[PDB]
Amino acid sequence: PLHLAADSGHLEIVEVLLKTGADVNAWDHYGFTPLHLAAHVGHLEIVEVLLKAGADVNAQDHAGWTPLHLAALYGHLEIVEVLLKHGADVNAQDMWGETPFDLADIAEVLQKAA
Amino acid sequence: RMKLMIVGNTGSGKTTLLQQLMGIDVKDWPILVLNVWDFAGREEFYSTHPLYLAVYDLSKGQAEVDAMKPWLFNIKAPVILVGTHLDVQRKACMSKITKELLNKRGFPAIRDYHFVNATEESDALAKLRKTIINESLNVELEKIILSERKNVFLNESGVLLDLYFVEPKWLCKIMAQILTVRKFPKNYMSQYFKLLEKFQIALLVPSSLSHCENSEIIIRLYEMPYFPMGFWSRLINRLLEISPRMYWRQGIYLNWSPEAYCLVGSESFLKITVPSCRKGCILLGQVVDHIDSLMEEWFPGTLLKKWALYSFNDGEEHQKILLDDLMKKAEEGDLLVNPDQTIPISQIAPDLILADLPRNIMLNNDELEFEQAPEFLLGSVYRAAYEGEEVAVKIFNKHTSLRLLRQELVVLCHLHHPSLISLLAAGIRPRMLVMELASKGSLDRLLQQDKASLTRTLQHRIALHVADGLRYLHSAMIIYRDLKPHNVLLFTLYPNAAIIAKIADYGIEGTPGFRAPEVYNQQADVYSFGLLLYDILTTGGRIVQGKLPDPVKEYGCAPWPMVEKLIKQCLKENPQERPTSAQVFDILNSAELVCLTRRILLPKNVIVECMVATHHNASIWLGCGHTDRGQLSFLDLNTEGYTSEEVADSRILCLALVHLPSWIVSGTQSGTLLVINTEDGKKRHTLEKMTDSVTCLYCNFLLVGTADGKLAIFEDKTVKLKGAAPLKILNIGNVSTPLMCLSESRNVMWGGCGTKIFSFSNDFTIQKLIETRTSQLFSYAAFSDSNIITVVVDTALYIAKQNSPVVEVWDKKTEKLCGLIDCVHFLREVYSGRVKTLCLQKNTALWIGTGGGHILLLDLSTRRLIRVIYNFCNSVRVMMTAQLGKNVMLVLGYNIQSCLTVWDINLPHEVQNLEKHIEVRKELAEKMRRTSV
Ligand SMILES: Cc1ccc(-n2nc(C(C)(C)C)cc2NC(=O)Nc2cccc(-c3c[nH]c4nc(Cl)nc(N5CCOCC5)c34)c2)cc1
């Protein structure tokens, strides 16, 4: 569903899911958040449209990857801020005890957001 | 606070004597402080507490005077006897009493035979009073604390009932509530019944209750002078067992089978009435064994006499014979000759001639057993040939009394386990037990003299088998007293054999070198097992309180981690948290235990992500990355020698070795490749600076893969000269795609850069460039579009991407994805799942060091998961094979602490071996238990 629709990033797929779906409300066999799945696969509009219906920025997975963590890890300058403005912003913790500053340009954004 | 107890039958004390002397009653009587206790007339069993003063009446006659026989015998399990008022002649009445009581012994020595005159006033009371005083007299800090607690060495003095709640009076007071049937909390009643059950009160409420033919039944008569207090109340409890119900307070005839009568019930007499059948014979054997265990375990009592009843013809009513004479008549011959010219022993006293043994075991001495030759000696155990197989026989020459033999086979016939020694042919005519031979014999004789055969797998098998057997013993509620290498019998020295060791107790609390510190529960057994396992691992070093230092420190034995941990966990100073043997077996049953050859902890807060071994005595070089400069560490496996040096400008990314039939080539993030002398260590120099960081080295001649795909070739002879130049540099991809992995495989080098695989021959030009991102149709983009970090190949490329659980299979010929391994799918059974290292050995298995700390390993032949070994280290970074000098594969992970675990190369083989072995043991145990009984 949203997990696969958050890879290629069709407008039609996410729009059909916008009318009906299980938005920001599922975990696949791996446990990824489909929202930040779409975030680190490297989209913008899919992530924002799924924010305006889910409004979630902190959600963990099997390894503890909250969106901010691996957003800082993957070196995405703008989508991290896009999740910062909408859905608000809160820092979180993974299972190894790592902060998004260490994984991360993004670190400076972390200081001003926090 | 000296302990004084008034012993009365009808409680004449609490009737009228208390105020004269001044349910269980406790009160203080100063003079010296004396704590007097009073007993009662509804007594059943409380004699655990047993000064004394015997109280009895005379006016009723003499039957009441001859009634304290159990009273005096409870004392040994200072006594003074006083009569009652006597005013309602008396000395003449006491004359028969005094002559009978004071004469001879058997009872405790009477201190004085005294009498009191009436309750209103007694002159003899003063005479009595000084008799109490003279014989009563013929750490402080606890006493002060003892006085303090009641306000809010004393325990045996009556101050404390150890630990108890409030005064000891309350426990006797609430026990009186049990005796009679105040208000008490229900929250602590569960604990109280446990204490109540310890006094035989529970199941049964002992205080609550208040077609035979001559020939077909066997009568066993016990005469004994008295029935001690609690004897019957406990006997009733212990004869509520089951083995292939109306009762009195004197007599519990548990009929069970209608054909298996057991009329056990009451000098005083005890009679056992059972029929002449196999079940009756067995049940008589069990009852006699239980009673003899009672009388030999707690209280002796020439003493009692044993009767056996017989009758040649039914006209005579049960002519009785002593058991000893019949024992001789059964040892020699089997019949009872009649006075006039008959009946065998098996119908008179079956347990003498062991007629109740299971039919599978009889010494069928029909020219089958052979022994007594001097060469056959194996202490009073000989070698015999039973049923054409060689066995070991132990004979009971002297003082057998048919008690050692019966108490030996009543436990040996009820233990059938592969690791418990088994019984063959329990016989009477020489009165011997025949035992299976230990072909290689006692363990200790092997440890002391045959150290050559102690392979690690054999040691683990011996320990595993002993733990299995002792777990079964503890399951059967049997405490195995004494566990040593002497009492562990090895049959075979073939490691994959099903039966390698059993445990067998040779009778002769434990020997002075192998007992638990408290010497006593199962936990003392576990301590004994820990001493055994220490003995195995050390191989008898200590053999030829307790504080046992590390075996490796002194004896120089091969370090065997996660068994030194088990030795230290079992071998604890207190029995409270040392493991139960239900779980000591579970711990020893693990291939991780079998094969984890070594584990090493690096200095604190050191990060290493690349490492190389030494090709010859063992050494390792690590590239440390905790500080963002160049940090190279040298580790020695045999003797820990971690030494870290600060070399090169930036963090070292990967090392590789080049040999000079040497040189270590360290690649740094700045891009320079720096070469260090391996032996001398002085001659050191750099090489050509590269455009970007270097990533991978060699895995082949000196291949060098940088972070822009610009793969260079460096010949073995080039590194001898400073600032060398490549034979050729071939560019494979753009700058944004680093070249990460190069692999040796039929002599072609494979590799992965960015998202593209490649291969090249000795021409050093790429002959194939496999495209892999298009495989995103399978799995999905976040995983498929990442980099490629490791590739291995034997029949298809096994590629691992950066932070992606899916490990992909790329056929070399078709150049098309034909397999993908969902690592998280394997991990769902038993915590990241993303692969971080991946190493393939021979063609048996490939090990996948997943980022969560799990070396999830597969049999690549069938794509089947063998084991999901867990390092206990939080993450794993690198996995590579080393020769050492025995093939091992050595693993490095992060916890921040970095752990380097060296594993014996065949974890998959050992997993299959141990699993098959445990299945063989399980079916063998089930079949043994099914067939034997
Ligand atoms: C009161 C009581 C006592 C024991 C038990 N008891 N409890 C158990 C278990 C709980 C463990 C089942 C077993 C038993 N009995 C036995 O173990 N008898 C036994 C006596 C003598 C020899 C063997 C023996 C068989 N083959 C051997 N081969 C070699 Cl080479 N040496 C051998 N011996 C000689 C030197 O070394 C030690 C042994 C032997 C076996 C009960 C009550």
Short mmCIF file of N, CA and C in Angstrom, two decimals, chain B residues 631-727:
data_model
loop_
_atom_site.label_atom_id
_atom_site.label_comp_id
_atom_site.label_asym_id
_atom_site.label_seq_id
_atom_site.Cartn_x
_atom_site.Cartn_y
_atom_site.Cartn_z
N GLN B 631 44.97 6.00 13.17
CA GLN B 631 45.20 5.24 14.39
C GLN B 631 45.25 3.76 14.04
N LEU B 632 46.41 3.14 14.23
CA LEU B 632 46.59 1.74 13.87
C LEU B 632 47.04 0.96 15.09
N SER B 633 46.35 -0.15 15.38
CA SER B 633 46.57 -0.91 16.59
C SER B 633 47.06 -2.31 16.26
N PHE B 634 47.94 -2.83 17.10
CA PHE B 634 48.48 -4.18 16.96
C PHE B 634 47.99 -5.02 18.13
N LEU B 635 47.37 -6.16 17.83
CA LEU B 635 46.84 -7.07 18.82
C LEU B 635 47.49 -8.44 18.66
N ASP B 636 47.75 -9.10 19.78
CA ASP B 636 48.34 -10.43 19.77
C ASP B 636 47.38 -11.40 20.44
N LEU B 637 47.05 -12.48 19.73
CA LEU B 637 46.00 -13.39 20.16
C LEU B 637 46.43 -14.30 21.30
N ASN B 638 47.64 -14.86 21.23
CA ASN B 638 48.10 -15.76 22.28
C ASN B 638 48.36 -14.99 23.58
N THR B 639 49.08 -13.88 23.50
CA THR B 639 49.42 -13.07 24.66
C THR B 639 48.96 -11.64 24.39
N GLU B 640 47.96 -11.18 25.15
CA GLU B 640 47.32 -9.90 24.86
C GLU B 640 48.34 -8.76 24.86
N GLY B 641 48.51 -8.13 23.71
CA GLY B 641 49.54 -7.12 23.53
C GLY B 641 49.09 -5.89 22.78
N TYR B 642 47.85 -5.46 23.00
CA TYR B 642 47.29 -4.32 22.28
C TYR B 642 48.16 -3.08 22.43
N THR B 643 48.73 -2.63 21.32
CA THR B 643 49.55 -1.42 21.28
C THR B 643 49.09 -0.56 20.12
N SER B 644 48.70 0.67 20.40
CA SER B 644 48.14 1.56 19.40
C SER B 644 49.12 2.68 19.07
N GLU B 645 49.31 2.93 17.77
CA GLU B 645 50.21 3.97 17.30
C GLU B 645 49.44 4.96 16.44
N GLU B 646 49.88 6.21 16.50
CA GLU B 646 49.28 7.33 15.77
C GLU B 646 50.09 7.50 14.50
N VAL B 647 49.56 7.01 13.38
CA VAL B 647 50.23 7.08 12.09
C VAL B 647 49.23 7.56 11.05
N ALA B 648 49.71 8.37 10.10
CA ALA B 648 48.92 8.89 8.99
C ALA B 648 47.97 9.99 9.44
N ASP B 649 47.61 10.88 8.52
CA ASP B 649 46.89 12.11 8.88
C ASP B 649 45.44 11.86 9.25
N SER B 650 44.71 11.06 8.48
CA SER B 650 43.29 10.88 8.72
C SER B 650 43.00 9.42 9.08
N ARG B 651 41.74 9.17 9.42
CA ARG B 651 41.33 7.85 9.88
C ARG B 651 41.64 6.79 8.83
N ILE B 652 42.14 5.65 9.28
CA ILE B 652 42.45 4.54 8.38
C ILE B 652 41.17 3.79 8.03
N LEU B 653 40.93 3.60 6.74
CA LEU B 653 39.69 3.00 6.26
C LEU B 653 39.78 1.50 6.04
N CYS B 654 40.87 1.00 5.45
CA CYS B 654 41.00 -0.44 5.32
C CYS B 654 42.46 -0.82 5.17
N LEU B 655 42.82 -1.97 5.74
CA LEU B 655 44.17 -2.51 5.63
C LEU B 655 44.17 -3.74 4.73
N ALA B 656 45.37 -4.08 4.26
CA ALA B 656 45.61 -5.32 3.55
C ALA B 656 47.09 -5.65 3.67
N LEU B 657 47.41 -6.90 3.39
CA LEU B 657 48.76 -7.43 3.54
C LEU B 657 49.37 -7.72 2.18
N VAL B 658 50.66 -7.45 2.08
CA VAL B 658 51.46 -7.91 0.95
C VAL B 658 52.71 -8.58 1.50
N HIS B 659 53.04 -9.74 0.95
CA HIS B 659 54.07 -10.63 1.45
C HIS B 659 55.29 -10.60 0.53
N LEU B 660 56.46 -10.88 1.10
CA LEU B 660 57.73 -10.84 0.38
C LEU B 660 58.48 -12.15 0.58
N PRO B 661 58.03 -13.24 -0.07
CA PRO B 661 58.71 -14.53 0.07
C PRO B 661 60.10 -14.53 -0.56
N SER B 662 57.64 -8.60 5.30
CA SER B 662 56.43 -8.28 4.56
C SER B 662 55.99 -6.84 4.82
N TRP B 663 54.91 -6.44 4.16
CA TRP B 663 54.43 -5.06 4.18
C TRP B 663 52.95 -5.05 4.53
N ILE B 664 52.55 -4.11 5.37
CA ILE B 664 51.15 -3.82 5.66
C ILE B 664 50.79 -2.51 4.98
N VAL B 665 49.71 -2.52 4.22
CA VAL B 665 49.28 -1.36 3.45
C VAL B 665 48.01 -0.82 4.09
N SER B 666 48.10 0.37 4.67
CA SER B 666 46.99 1.02 5.33
C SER B 666 46.48 2.13 4.43
N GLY B 667 45.18 2.17 4.21
CA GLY B 667 44.57 3.17 3.36
C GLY B 667 43.78 4.17 4.19
N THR B 668 44.09 5.44 3.99
CA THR B 668 43.56 6.50 4.84
C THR B 668 42.59 7.37 4.07
N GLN B 669 41.69 8.03 4.82
CA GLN B 669 40.64 8.84 4.21
C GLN B 669 41.19 10.01 3.40
N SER B 670 42.36 10.54 3.76
CA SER B 670 42.95 11.59 2.94
C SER B 670 43.26 11.09 1.55
N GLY B 671 43.46 9.78 1.41
CA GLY B 671 43.75 9.17 0.14
C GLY B 671 45.13 8.56 0.05
N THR B 672 46.05 8.92 0.93
CA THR B 672 47.38 8.35 0.88
C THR B 672 47.32 6.90 1.33
N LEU B 673 48.11 6.06 0.69
CA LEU B 673 48.31 4.69 1.13
C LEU B 673 49.67 4.61 1.80
N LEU B 674 49.71 4.17 3.05
CA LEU B 674 50.94 4.18 3.81
C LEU B 674 51.33 2.74 4.10
N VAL B 675 52.60 2.41 3.90
CA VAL B 675 53.12 1.06 4.06
C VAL B 675 54.03 1.03 5.28
N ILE B 676 53.82 0.05 6.15
CA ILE B 676 54.60 -0.10 7.38
C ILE B 676 55.35 -1.42 7.30
N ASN B 677 56.58 -1.44 7.81
CA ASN B 677 57.29 -2.70 7.94
C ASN B 677 56.61 -3.59 8.96
N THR B 678 56.35 -4.83 8.56
CA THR B 678 55.68 -5.78 9.44
C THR B 678 56.59 -6.31 10.54
N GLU B 679 57.84 -6.64 10.22
CA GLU B 679 58.74 -7.23 11.21
C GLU B 679 59.59 -6.16 11.89
N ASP B 680 60.43 -5.47 11.12
CA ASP B 680 61.35 -4.50 11.70
C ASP B 680 60.59 -3.30 12.27
N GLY B 681 59.63 -2.77 11.51
CA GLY B 681 58.83 -1.66 11.95
C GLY B 681 59.48 -0.30 11.82
N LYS B 682 60.71 -0.22 11.30
CA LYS B 682 61.36 1.07 11.15
C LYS B 682 61.21 1.59 9.73
N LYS B 683 61.45 0.74 8.74
CA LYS B 683 61.37 1.13 7.33
C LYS B 683 59.91 1.34 6.96
N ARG B 684 59.48 2.60 6.90
CA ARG B 684 58.10 2.94 6.63
C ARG B 684 58.05 4.08 5.62
N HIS B 685 57.04 4.06 4.76
CA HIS B 685 56.93 5.08 3.72
C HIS B 685 55.51 5.10 3.19
N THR B 686 55.20 6.14 2.42
CA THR B 686 53.88 6.29 1.83
C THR B 686 53.89 5.84 0.38
N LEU B 687 52.75 6.02 -0.29
CA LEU B 687 52.62 5.74 -1.71
C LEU B 687 51.92 6.90 -2.40
N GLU B 688 51.50 6.70 -3.65
CA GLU B 688 50.86 7.77 -4.39
C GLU B 688 49.58 8.24 -3.71
N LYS B 689 49.50 9.53 -3.45
CA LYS B 689 48.27 10.16 -3.00
C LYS B 689 47.19 9.96 -4.06
N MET B 690 46.00 9.59 -3.63
CA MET B 690 44.91 9.34 -4.56
C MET B 690 43.88 10.46 -4.48
N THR B 691 43.06 10.55 -5.52
CA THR B 691 42.18 11.71 -5.66
C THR B 691 41.21 11.82 -4.49
N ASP B 692 40.57 10.72 -4.13
CA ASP B 692 39.66 10.70 -3.00
C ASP B 692 40.09 9.61 -2.03
N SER B 693 39.25 9.37 -1.02
CA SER B 693 39.57 8.38 -0.01
C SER B 693 39.67 6.99 -0.62
N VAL B 694 40.50 6.16 -0.01
CA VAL B 694 40.62 4.76 -0.39
C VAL B 694 39.65 3.96 0.45
N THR B 695 39.04 2.95 -0.16
CA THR B 695 38.02 2.16 0.51
C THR B 695 38.45 0.71 0.73
N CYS B 696 38.83 0.01 -0.33
CA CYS B 696 39.11 -1.42 -0.24
C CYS B 696 40.50 -1.72 -0.76
N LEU B 697 41.15 -2.71 -0.16
CA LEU B 697 42.49 -3.09 -0.59
C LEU B 697 42.58 -4.59 -0.82
N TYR B 698 43.11 -4.97 -1.97
CA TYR B 698 43.58 -6.32 -2.30
C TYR B 698 42.37 -7.24 -2.32
N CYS B 699 42.30 -8.25 -1.46
CA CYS B 699 41.40 -9.39 -1.59
C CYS B 699 41.61 -10.06 -2.96
N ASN B 700 42.82 -10.55 -3.15
CA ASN B 700 43.22 -11.23 -4.38
C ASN B 700 43.53 -12.70 -4.09
N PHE B 701 46.84 -8.46 -7.62
CA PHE B 701 47.98 -7.96 -6.86
C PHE B 701 47.93 -6.45 -6.57
N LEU B 702 47.92 -6.16 -5.27
CA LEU B 702 47.56 -4.93 -4.56
C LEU B 702 46.49 -4.11 -5.29
N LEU B 703 45.32 -4.68 -5.49
CA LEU B 703 44.20 -3.89 -5.98
C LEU B 703 43.92 -2.79 -4.97
N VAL B 704 43.52 -1.61 -5.44
CA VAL B 704 43.20 -0.49 -4.56
C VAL B 704 41.94 0.19 -5.06
N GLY B 705 40.86 0.10 -4.30
CA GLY B 705 39.63 0.75 -4.70
C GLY B 705 39.31 1.96 -3.86
N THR B 706 39.25 3.13 -4.49
CA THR B 706 39.04 4.40 -3.82
C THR B 706 37.55 4.69 -3.68
N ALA B 707 37.23 5.93 -3.30
CA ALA B 707 35.86 6.36 -3.08
C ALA B 707 35.25 7.06 -4.28
N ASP B 708 35.92 7.04 -5.43
CA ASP B 708 35.38 7.60 -6.66
C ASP B 708 35.32 6.57 -7.79
N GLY B 709 35.48 5.29 -7.49
CA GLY B 709 35.46 4.25 -8.49
C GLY B 709 36.77 4.06 -9.21
N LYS B 710 37.77 4.87 -8.90
CA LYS B 710 39.03 4.90 -9.63
C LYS B 710 39.92 3.79 -9.07
N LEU B 711 39.78 2.59 -9.62
CA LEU B 711 40.48 1.43 -9.07
C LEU B 711 41.88 1.37 -9.65
N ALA B 712 42.87 1.25 -8.79
CA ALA B 712 44.26 1.18 -9.22
C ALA B 712 44.83 -0.21 -8.99
N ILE B 713 45.91 -0.51 -9.71
CA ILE B 713 46.65 -1.75 -9.51
C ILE B 713 48.01 -1.39 -8.93
N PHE B 714 48.43 -2.09 -7.89
CA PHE B 714 49.77 -1.95 -7.35
C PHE B 714 50.41 -3.33 -7.26
N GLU B 715 51.56 -3.48 -7.92
CA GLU B 715 52.26 -4.75 -7.90
C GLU B 715 53.02 -4.95 -6.60
N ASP B 716 53.25 -6.22 -6.27
CA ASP B 716 53.92 -6.57 -5.03
C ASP B 716 55.32 -5.96 -4.97
N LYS B 717 55.99 -5.83 -6.11
CA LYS B 717 57.32 -5.25 -6.13
C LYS B 717 57.31 -3.72 -6.05
N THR B 718 56.18 -3.09 -6.36
CA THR B 718 56.14 -1.63 -6.38
C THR B 718 56.24 -1.03 -4.98
N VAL B 719 55.60 -1.67 -4.00
CA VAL B 719 55.56 -1.14 -2.64
C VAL B 719 56.94 -1.07 -2.00
N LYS B 720 57.92 -1.79 -2.54
CA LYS B 720 59.28 -1.68 -2.04
C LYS B 720 59.85 -0.28 -2.25
N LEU B 721 59.33 0.45 -3.23
CA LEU B 721 59.84 1.77 -3.55
C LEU B 721 58.86 2.86 -3.13
N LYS B 722 59.40 3.95 -2.60
CA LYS B 722 58.59 5.04 -2.06
C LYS B 722 57.84 5.75 -3.18
N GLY B 723 56.58 6.09 -2.92
CA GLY B 723 55.78 6.86 -3.86
C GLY B 723 55.55 6.13 -5.16
N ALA B 724 55.07 4.90 -5.07
CA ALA B 724 54.96 4.04 -6.24
C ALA B 724 53.89 4.55 -7.20
N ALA B 725 53.89 3.97 -8.39
CA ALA B 725 52.94 4.30 -9.43
C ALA B 725 52.18 3.04 -9.83
N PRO B 726 50.90 3.17 -10.13
CA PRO B 726 50.11 2.00 -10.52
C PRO B 726 50.54 1.45 -11.87
N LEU B 727 50.42 0.13 -12.01
CA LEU B 727 50.55 -0.46 -13.33
C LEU B 727 49.47 0.09 -14.25
#
